[PDB]
Every structure is written in C-alpha cells, then in structure tokens.
Amino acid sequence: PMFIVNTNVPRASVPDGFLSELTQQLAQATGKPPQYIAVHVVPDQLMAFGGSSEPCALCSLHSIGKIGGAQNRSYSKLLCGLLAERLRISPDRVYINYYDMNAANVGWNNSTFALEH
Amino acid sequence: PMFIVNTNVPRASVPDGFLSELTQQLAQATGKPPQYIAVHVVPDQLMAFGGSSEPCALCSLHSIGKIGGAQNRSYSKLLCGLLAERLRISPDRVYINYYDMNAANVGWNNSTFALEHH
Amino acid sequence: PMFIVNTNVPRASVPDGFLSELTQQLAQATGKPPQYIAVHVVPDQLMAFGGSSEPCALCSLHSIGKIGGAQNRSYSKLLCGLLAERLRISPDRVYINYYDMNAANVGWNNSTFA
C-alpha cells in the first residue's frame, strides 16, 4: 500500500514518529505486511479547502484490494484521527482518495505484482 | 472536488488570489458548493513536457460525478484558460487528468461520502 | 503519457540528463512521440518504504492505452533500472502506479483527447 498526505501544515509541526505511526497503523488496518507499506508526507503546501487556508490535507491511499465501503470508512476514521491528533487538522478539512489497484497495474522490483501470466 | 496543479513556474509567478479564483471558478463549473472545493498549487517543480522545460503544468481534477466527455472539454477550456492567463503557461503544454470518484472511495470527516449502507 | 517520480533522494543526486533520458526512454517504451511525453521528478521528499527512510521512490505512469500486463512489466524493468542506475534506489523500494486513462478523461490544449 501507498499513503500520501499533502498539507499546508509546516514541516516543523510534523512530530517525531509520524511516518512510523502511519506505517504501522496502516499495516494493521489493511492487513498488509508493514514491509510493503509506503508513506509520504508533504508539508508546507500552497492549498485551500473551501477557499480557506486554515490547516487542511489532501491524501491518497492505494492498495491492491482491501478497498471498499466499510473498509474505507474505517481507514478514514483512523487517518483523520491521526491527522487531527498529530497535525491538528480538522477531519472536515481532509479528503482521502482511495484507489483499488489491480496487481497488474502496480510496478515493483523490476516487474509488477502480476506474476501469473 | 479536488484540483491539483503541478508546475515549473516560480512561486512568485503565482498571483495572490489564484487559489480563490480556482475555487470559485470550479464551484461554478461543477455545480458543487465552494465549501467542498479543494485546490492545491505546487510551483517550482522539476519537470519537462515534450523534452522542454518551458512553462508547463500537470494537473488533476477529482470529482464525485460531474465528470464526462463534454463536461471535461468544458473544464479543459476553463482551466487551460486560467493557467494561460494567470501563470503564462501555453495550453498545449498542459495535461489535466480527470477522475470520476465513487462516493465510497472518498474519505472525509472521519468517514466517506458513502453514508447510506453498511 | 506522463511519468511522475517522488523520492527522498536529495536533488543534488539527480544527474544532469535525467529528465531527458526519461522522456526519450518512455517515448520508446510506450511507442508515443516524445513531444507528448511529460516527466516530473520530485526529490528531497519525506517518505518511508517498509518503515525505512533509505532511498525509495513512489511513481506513477499515466497513458491513454499502452497499459497492460506485459507492457507494465516492461515499463517497470526500464524505470526501476533507471532509478537504480541514476538515483541509486533499490528496485524493491520502488512502487509505480500505472493508469490506463480514457481519452475523454485527459485534457490538453483547451480540449480533451476525445
């Protein structure tokens, strides 16, 4: 899985431990091994939510499977919770785009995750 | 909706009020309320288009619905026009990827926009 | 086509010629003319792969067609090869998301490719 957060929150406000907390909690939430979890945090961004430049975040989560109605709501509760607690961003100023990736459409280690045919 | 612009144009070349103009114009174009429009501009990027590092932009528009052939043609005229006028980027050096998002695949406010079923 | 690479490798470690090599090699790999290839490199990123901040890369390739099983494996061998040779990133610390874009969902030059 791949999780990206873009935010106008300053880099200085990103707490020690944040990438690791995201890695571990996403490994657990998605059921994928932590060795395969990638996280990417992009602070100090020029962005607005609703025309306001108060703290906000635009995120994406890509996973091969484990994407769907109830699962995505659980991911959103988890991730908004972390963004609120760690970055002081209001949950109603976060968007997370979820992508259910086909294994053939993910590159890794000189090939893809479609190794069957 | 979510609109992202990635460009090699300098930050100083991004006019004050650009994010607000994008918000208002996108609210008007999509019919979605401005309170729900998110805009993101990323200047000073290391990029090339056609092998050239002249001004260019790589953009995305995500929306739950309001995405389609004719609408996307309209969005493209609108957005290329704004990037040309405000950032001085030529329309033939802009790519805009459109994404029609399912409500269940957009997180917001501790949940998603799929609030109807369990 | 458009190719984006986000990496925690420092900007100074990106070699002269890198954007041009990507442009030209993707033009060849995808069969599309180089004048329509867009490339975007974002160094100095705060990221981790498997909980480690050793060199890694998160990438995307968007194309109208020319996306599929065998083709994507070929793109990945090409791109991981370039990332290893040029940026010293291990192939097993690279993810590349491939997107087969509908022509109606790609805007360019005031209209779309549809």
PDB file of N, CA and C in Angstrom, chain B residues 6-7 42 44-51 53 58-59 67-69 72-73 76-78 80-81 91-100, chain C residues 1-4 6 11 14 19-20 23 34-43 62 99 101 104-114:
ATOM      1  N   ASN B   6       0.499  21.024 -10.743  1.00  0.00           N
ATOM      2  CA  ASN B   6       1.945  20.914 -10.573  1.00  0.00           C
ATOM      3  C   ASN B   6       2.610  21.646 -11.733  1.00  0.00           C
ATOM      4  N   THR B   7       3.506  22.576 -11.427  1.00  0.00           N
ATOM      5  CA  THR B   7       4.096  23.399 -12.476  1.00  0.00           C
ATOM      6  C   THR B   7       5.533  23.790 -12.166  1.00  0.00           C
ATOM      7  N   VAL B  42       1.386  23.624  -6.816  1.00  0.00           N
ATOM      8  CA  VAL B  42       2.744  23.233  -6.470  1.00  0.00           C
ATOM      9  C   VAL B  42       3.697  23.803  -7.510  1.00  0.00           C
ATOM     10  N   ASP B  44       7.520  25.666  -8.881  1.00  0.00           N
ATOM     11  CA  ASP B  44       8.958  25.428  -8.777  1.00  0.00           C
ATOM     12  C   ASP B  44       9.328  23.962  -8.971  1.00  0.00           C
ATOM     13  N   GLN B  45       8.500  23.242  -9.718  1.00  0.00           N
ATOM     14  CA  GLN B  45       8.719  21.819  -9.926  1.00  0.00           C
ATOM     15  C   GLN B  45       9.728  21.533 -11.027  1.00  0.00           C
ATOM     16  N   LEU B  46      10.456  20.432 -10.870  1.00  0.00           N
ATOM     17  CA  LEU B  46      11.402  19.988 -11.882  1.00  0.00           C
ATOM     18  C   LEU B  46      10.653  19.097 -12.866  1.00  0.00           C
ATOM     19  N   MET B  47      10.279  19.655 -14.010  1.00  0.00           N
ATOM     20  CA  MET B  47       9.526  18.883 -14.983  1.00  0.00           C
ATOM     21  C   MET B  47       9.841  19.285 -16.413  1.00  0.00           C
ATOM     22  N   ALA B  48       9.445  18.432 -17.347  1.00  0.00           N
ATOM     23  CA  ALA B  48       9.587  18.720 -18.763  1.00  0.00           C
ATOM     24  C   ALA B  48       8.338  18.238 -19.477  1.00  0.00           C
ATOM     25  N   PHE B  49       8.015  18.896 -20.583  1.00  0.00           N
ATOM     26  CA  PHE B  49       6.892  18.494 -21.412  1.00  0.00           C
ATOM     27  C   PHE B  49       7.413  18.483 -22.841  1.00  0.00           C
ATOM     28  N   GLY B  50       7.369  17.319 -23.478  1.00  0.00           N
ATOM     29  CA  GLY B  50       7.927  17.199 -24.816  1.00  0.00           C
ATOM     30  C   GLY B  50       9.436  17.375 -24.866  1.00  0.00           C
ATOM     31  N   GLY B  51      10.099  17.208 -23.726  1.00  0.00           N
ATOM     32  CA  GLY B  51      11.545  17.346 -23.684  1.00  0.00           C
ATOM     33  C   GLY B  51      11.989  18.771 -23.408  1.00  0.00           C
ATOM     34  N   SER B  53      11.750  22.328 -20.933  1.00  0.00           N
ATOM     35  CA  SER B  53      11.469  22.813 -19.588  1.00  0.00           C
ATOM     36  C   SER B  53      10.871  24.219 -19.605  1.00  0.00           C
ATOM     37  N   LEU B  58       1.089  19.924 -14.981  1.00  0.00           N
ATOM     38  CA  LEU B  58       0.447  18.618 -14.926  1.00  0.00           C
ATOM     39  C   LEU B  58      -0.588  18.666 -13.816  1.00  0.00           C
ATOM     40  N   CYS B  59      -1.849  18.435 -14.172  1.00  0.00           N
ATOM     41  CA  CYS B  59      -2.965  18.718 -13.275  1.00  0.00           C
ATOM     42  C   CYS B  59      -3.877  17.511 -13.093  1.00  0.00           C
ATOM     43  N   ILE B  67     -18.239  14.363 -14.152  1.00  0.00           N
ATOM     44  CA  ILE B  67     -17.083  14.069 -14.990  1.00  0.00           C
ATOM     45  C   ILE B  67     -17.566  13.332 -16.233  1.00  0.00           C
ATOM     46  N   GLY B  68     -17.153  13.806 -17.405  1.00  0.00           N
ATOM     47  CA  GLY B  68     -17.577  13.170 -18.640  1.00  0.00           C
ATOM     48  C   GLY B  68     -17.076  13.893 -19.875  1.00  0.00           C
ATOM     49  N   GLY B  69     -17.353  13.326 -21.046  1.00  0.00           N
ATOM     50  CA  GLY B  69     -16.807  13.861 -22.283  1.00  0.00           C
ATOM     51  C   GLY B  69     -16.970  15.356 -22.481  1.00  0.00           C
ATOM     52  N   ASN B  72     -15.759  17.518 -19.418  1.00  0.00           N
ATOM     53  CA  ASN B  72     -14.303  17.564 -19.367  1.00  0.00           C
ATOM     54  C   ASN B  72     -13.732  18.488 -20.437  1.00  0.00           C
ATOM     55  N   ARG B  73     -14.390  18.555 -21.590  1.00  0.00           N
ATOM     56  CA  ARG B  73     -13.974  19.510 -22.607  1.00  0.00           C
ATOM     57  C   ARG B  73     -14.163  20.932 -22.098  1.00  0.00           C
ATOM     58  N   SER B  76     -11.572  21.754 -19.423  1.00  0.00           N
ATOM     59  CA  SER B  76     -10.252  21.928 -20.014  1.00  0.00           C
ATOM     60  C   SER B  76     -10.089  23.321 -20.606  1.00  0.00           C
ATOM     61  N   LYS B  77     -11.129  23.815 -21.271  1.00  0.00           N
ATOM     62  CA  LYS B  77     -11.096  25.168 -21.813  1.00  0.00           C
ATOM     63  C   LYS B  77     -10.995  26.181 -20.675  1.00  0.00           C
ATOM     64  N   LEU B  78     -11.773  25.954 -19.623  1.00  0.00           N
ATOM     65  CA  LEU B  78     -11.757  26.823 -18.453  1.00  0.00           C
ATOM     66  C   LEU B  78     -10.378  26.841 -17.800  1.00  0.00           C
ATOM     67  N   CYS B  80      -7.310  25.522 -18.783  1.00  0.00           N
ATOM     68  CA  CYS B  80      -6.203  25.952 -19.632  1.00  0.00           C
ATOM     69  C   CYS B  80      -6.219  27.471 -19.764  1.00  0.00           C
ATOM     70  N   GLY B  81      -7.416  28.041 -19.862  1.00  0.00           N
ATOM     71  CA  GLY B  81      -7.526  29.484 -19.972  1.00  0.00           C
ATOM     72  C   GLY B  81      -6.987  30.185 -18.742  1.00  0.00           C
ATOM     73  N   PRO B  91      -1.469  26.393 -23.435  1.00  0.00           N
ATOM     74  CA  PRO B  91      -2.435  25.294 -23.323  1.00  0.00           C
ATOM     75  C   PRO B  91      -1.941  23.954 -23.864  1.00  0.00           C
ATOM     76  N   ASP B  92      -1.081  23.981 -24.879  1.00  0.00           N
ATOM     77  CA  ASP B  92      -0.571  22.735 -25.429  1.00  0.00           C
ATOM     78  C   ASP B  92       0.592  22.187 -24.610  1.00  0.00           C
ATOM     79  N   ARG B  93       0.874  22.825 -23.479  1.00  0.00           N
ATOM     80  CA  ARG B  93       1.829  22.271 -22.526  1.00  0.00           C
ATOM     81  C   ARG B  93       1.163  22.016 -21.177  1.00  0.00           C
ATOM     82  N   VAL B  94      -0.135  21.738 -21.223  1.00  0.00           N
ATOM     83  CA  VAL B  94      -0.891  21.358 -20.032  1.00  0.00           C
ATOM     84  C   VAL B  94      -1.546  19.989 -20.215  1.00  0.00           C
ATOM     85  N   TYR B  95      -1.373  19.111 -19.229  1.00  0.00           N
ATOM     86  CA  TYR B  95      -2.175  17.896 -19.149  1.00  0.00           C
ATOM     87  C   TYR B  95      -3.075  17.983 -17.922  1.00  0.00           C
ATOM     88  N   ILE B  96      -4.338  17.611 -18.092  1.00  0.00           N
ATOM     89  CA  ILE B  96      -5.263  17.517 -16.968  1.00  0.00           C
ATOM     90  C   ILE B  96      -5.896  16.132 -16.952  1.00  0.00           C
ATOM     91  N   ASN B  97      -5.620  15.363 -15.901  1.00  0.00           N
ATOM     92  CA  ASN B  97      -6.255  14.064 -15.732  1.00  0.00           C
ATOM     93  C   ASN B  97      -7.551  14.214 -14.940  1.00  0.00           C
ATOM     94  N   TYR B  98      -8.655  13.724 -15.503  1.00  0.00           N
ATOM     95  CA  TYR B  98      -9.942  13.769 -14.818  1.00  0.00           C
ATOM     96  C   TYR B  98     -10.270  12.429 -14.169  1.00  0.00           C
ATOM     97  N   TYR B  99     -10.780  12.482 -12.942  1.00  0.00           N
ATOM     98  CA  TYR B  99     -11.124  11.277 -12.200  1.00  0.00           C
ATOM     99  C   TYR B  99     -12.545  11.377 -11.664  1.00  0.00           C
ATOM    100  N   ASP B 100     -13.400  10.460 -12.104  1.00  0.00           N
ATOM    101  CA  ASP B 100     -14.757  10.349 -11.579  1.00  0.00           C
ATOM    102  C   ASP B 100     -14.714   9.409 -10.378  1.00  0.00           C
TER     103      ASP B 100
ATOM    104  N   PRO C   1       1.817  10.604 -22.648  1.00  0.00           N
ATOM    105  CA  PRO C   1       1.993   9.952 -21.328  1.00  0.00           C
ATOM    106  C   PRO C   1       2.613  10.913 -20.325  1.00  0.00           C
ATOM    107  N   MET C   2       2.385  10.659 -19.040  1.00  0.00           N
ATOM    108  CA  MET C   2       3.065  11.435 -18.014  1.00  0.00           C
ATOM    109  C   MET C   2       3.623  10.526 -16.934  1.00  0.00           C
ATOM    110  N   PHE C   3       4.880  10.769 -16.575  1.00  0.00           N
ATOM    111  CA  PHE C   3       5.557   9.982 -15.553  1.00  0.00           C
ATOM    112  C   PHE C   3       5.992  10.880 -14.410  1.00  0.00           C
ATOM    113  N   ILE C   4       5.623  10.498 -13.193  1.00  0.00           N
ATOM    114  CA  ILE C   4       5.974  11.263 -12.003  1.00  0.00           C
ATOM    115  C   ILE C   4       6.784  10.361 -11.083  1.00  0.00           C
ATOM    116  N   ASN C   6       8.377  10.571  -7.178  1.00  0.00           N
ATOM    117  CA  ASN C   6       8.619  11.225  -5.899  1.00  0.00           C
ATOM    118  C   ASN C   6       9.642  10.373  -5.155  1.00  0.00           C
ATOM    119  N   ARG C  11      18.102  16.423  -4.157  1.00  0.00           N
ATOM    120  CA  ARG C  11      18.093  16.972  -5.508  1.00  0.00           C
ATOM    121  C   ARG C  11      19.470  16.922  -6.163  1.00  0.00           C
ATOM    122  N   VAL C  14      20.301  13.922  -8.322  1.00  0.00           N
ATOM    123  CA  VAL C  14      19.688  13.739  -9.635  1.00  0.00           C
ATOM    124  C   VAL C  14      20.655  14.217 -10.713  1.00  0.00           C
ATOM    125  N   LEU C  19      15.859  14.049 -16.797  1.00  0.00           N
ATOM    126  CA  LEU C  19      14.550  14.322 -17.379  1.00  0.00           C
ATOM    127  C   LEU C  19      14.520  13.951 -18.861  1.00  0.00           C
ATOM    128  N   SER C  20      15.636  14.164 -19.551  1.00  0.00           N
ATOM    129  CA  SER C  20      15.695  13.883 -20.981  1.00  0.00           C
ATOM    130  C   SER C  20      15.738  12.386 -21.246  1.00  0.00           C
ATOM    131  N   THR C  23      12.256  11.093 -20.722  1.00  0.00           N
ATOM    132  CA  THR C  23      11.411  11.497 -21.840  1.00  0.00           C
ATOM    133  C   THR C  23      11.648  10.570 -23.025  1.00  0.00           C
ATOM    134  N   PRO C  34       7.881  11.602 -28.513  1.00  0.00           N
ATOM    135  CA  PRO C  34       8.488  12.269 -27.355  1.00  0.00           C
ATOM    136  C   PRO C  34       7.912  13.652 -27.042  1.00  0.00           C
ATOM    137  N   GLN C  35       7.313  14.303 -28.037  1.00  0.00           N
ATOM    138  CA  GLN C  35       6.769  15.640 -27.826  1.00  0.00           C
ATOM    139  C   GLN C  35       5.513  15.618 -26.960  1.00  0.00           C
ATOM    140  N   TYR C  36       4.963  14.429 -26.735  1.00  0.00           N
ATOM    141  CA  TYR C  36       3.783  14.284 -25.888  1.00  0.00           C
ATOM    142  C   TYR C  36       4.102  13.636 -24.543  1.00  0.00           C
ATOM    143  N   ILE C  37       5.385  13.405 -24.276  1.00  0.00           N
ATOM    144  CA  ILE C  37       5.797  12.803 -23.008  1.00  0.00           C
ATOM    145  C   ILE C  37       6.088  13.875 -21.964  1.00  0.00           C
ATOM    146  N   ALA C  38       5.397  13.798 -20.829  1.00  0.00           N
ATOM    147  CA  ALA C  38       5.654  14.706 -19.718  1.00  0.00           C
ATOM    148  C   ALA C  38       6.327  13.935 -18.593  1.00  0.00           C
ATOM    149  N   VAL C  39       7.347  14.537 -17.990  1.00  0.00           N
ATOM    150  CA  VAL C  39       8.080  13.910 -16.899  1.00  0.00           C
ATOM    151  C   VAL C  39       8.243  14.890 -15.746  1.00  0.00           C
ATOM    152  N   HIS C  40       8.186  14.370 -14.525  1.00  0.00           N
ATOM    153  CA  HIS C  40       8.149  15.210 -13.338  1.00  0.00           C
ATOM    154  C   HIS C  40       8.901  14.471 -12.237  1.00  0.00           C
ATOM    155  N   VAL C  41       9.958  15.095 -11.733  1.00  0.00           N
ATOM    156  CA  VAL C  41      10.796  14.489 -10.708  1.00  0.00           C
ATOM    157  C   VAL C  41      10.764  15.343  -9.450  1.00  0.00           C
ATOM    158  N   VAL C  42      10.458  14.714  -8.321  1.00  0.00           N
ATOM    159  CA  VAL C  42      10.318  15.441  -7.065  1.00  0.00           C
ATOM    160  C   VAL C  42      11.235  14.832  -6.009  1.00  0.00           C
ATOM    161  N   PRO C  43      12.425  15.421  -5.824  1.00  0.00           N
ATOM    162  CA  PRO C  43      13.415  14.965  -4.843  1.00  0.00           C
ATOM    163  C   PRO C  43      13.163  15.498  -3.432  1.00  0.00           C
ATOM    164  N   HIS C  62       0.872   7.536 -16.329  1.00  0.00           N
ATOM    165  CA  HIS C  62      -0.451   7.650 -16.939  1.00  0.00           C
ATOM    166  C   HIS C  62      -0.287   7.597 -18.451  1.00  0.00           C
ATOM    167  N   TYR C  99      -1.723   3.857 -14.783  1.00  0.00           N
ATOM    168  CA  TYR C  99      -3.091   4.266 -15.062  1.00  0.00           C
ATOM    169  C   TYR C  99      -3.361   4.255 -16.559  1.00  0.00           C
ATOM    170  N   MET C 101      -5.596   5.718 -18.962  1.00  0.00           N
ATOM    171  CA  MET C 101      -6.528   6.838 -18.992  1.00  0.00           C
ATOM    172  C   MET C 101      -7.436   6.765 -20.215  1.00  0.00           C
ATOM    173  N   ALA C 104     -11.189  10.663 -23.060  1.00  0.00           N
ATOM    174  CA  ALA C 104     -12.141  11.693 -22.663  1.00  0.00           C
ATOM    175  C   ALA C 104     -11.805  12.250 -21.282  1.00  0.00           C
ATOM    176  N   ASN C 105     -10.946  11.541 -20.554  1.00  0.00           N
ATOM    177  CA  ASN C 105     -10.566  11.933 -19.200  1.00  0.00           C
ATOM    178  C   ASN C 105      -9.172  12.562 -19.160  1.00  0.00           C
ATOM    179  N   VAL C 106      -8.665  12.962 -20.323  1.00  0.00           N
ATOM    180  CA  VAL C 106      -7.396  13.681 -20.390  1.00  0.00           C
ATOM    181  C   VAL C 106      -7.558  15.007 -21.127  1.00  0.00           C
ATOM    182  N   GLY C 107      -7.345  16.102 -20.405  1.00  0.00           N
ATOM    183  CA  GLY C 107      -7.418  17.418 -21.010  1.00  0.00           C
ATOM    184  C   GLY C 107      -6.072  17.870 -21.537  1.00  0.00           C
ATOM    185  N   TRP C 108      -6.096  18.567 -22.666  1.00  0.00           N
ATOM    186  CA  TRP C 108      -4.881  19.094 -23.273  1.00  0.00           C
ATOM    187  C   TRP C 108      -5.269  20.124 -24.322  1.00  0.00           C
ATOM    188  N   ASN C 109      -4.571  21.253 -24.325  1.00  0.00           N
ATOM    189  CA  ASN C 109      -4.741  22.260 -25.368  1.00  0.00           C
ATOM    190  C   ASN C 109      -6.198  22.706 -25.488  1.00  0.00           C
ATOM    191  N   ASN C 110      -6.795  23.066 -24.355  1.00  0.00           N
ATOM    192  CA  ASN C 110      -8.139  23.644 -24.317  1.00  0.00           C
ATOM    193  C   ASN C 110      -9.285  22.664 -24.564  1.00  0.00           C
ATOM    194  N   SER C 111      -8.964  21.405 -24.838  1.00  0.00           N
ATOM    195  CA  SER C 111      -9.996  20.391 -25.019  1.00  0.00           C
ATOM    196  C   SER C 111      -9.550  19.085 -24.375  1.00  0.00           C
ATOM    197  N   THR C 112     -10.090  17.969 -24.853  1.00  0.00           N
ATOM    198  CA  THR C 112      -9.627  16.654 -24.417  1.00  0.00           C
ATOM    199  C   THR C 112      -9.202  15.835 -25.628  1.00  0.00           C
ATOM    200  N   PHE C 113      -8.602  14.675 -25.381  1.00  0.00           N
ATOM    201  CA  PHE C 113      -8.121  13.830 -26.467  1.00  0.00           C
ATOM    202  C   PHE C 113      -9.235  13.013 -27.105  1.00  0.00           C
ATOM    203  N   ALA C 114     -10.445  13.150 -26.576  1.00  0.00           N
ATOM    204  CA  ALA C 114     -11.600  12.507 -27.179  1.00  0.00           C
ATOM    205  C   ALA C 114     -12.103  13.352 -28.345  1.00  0.00           C
TER     206      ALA C 114
END
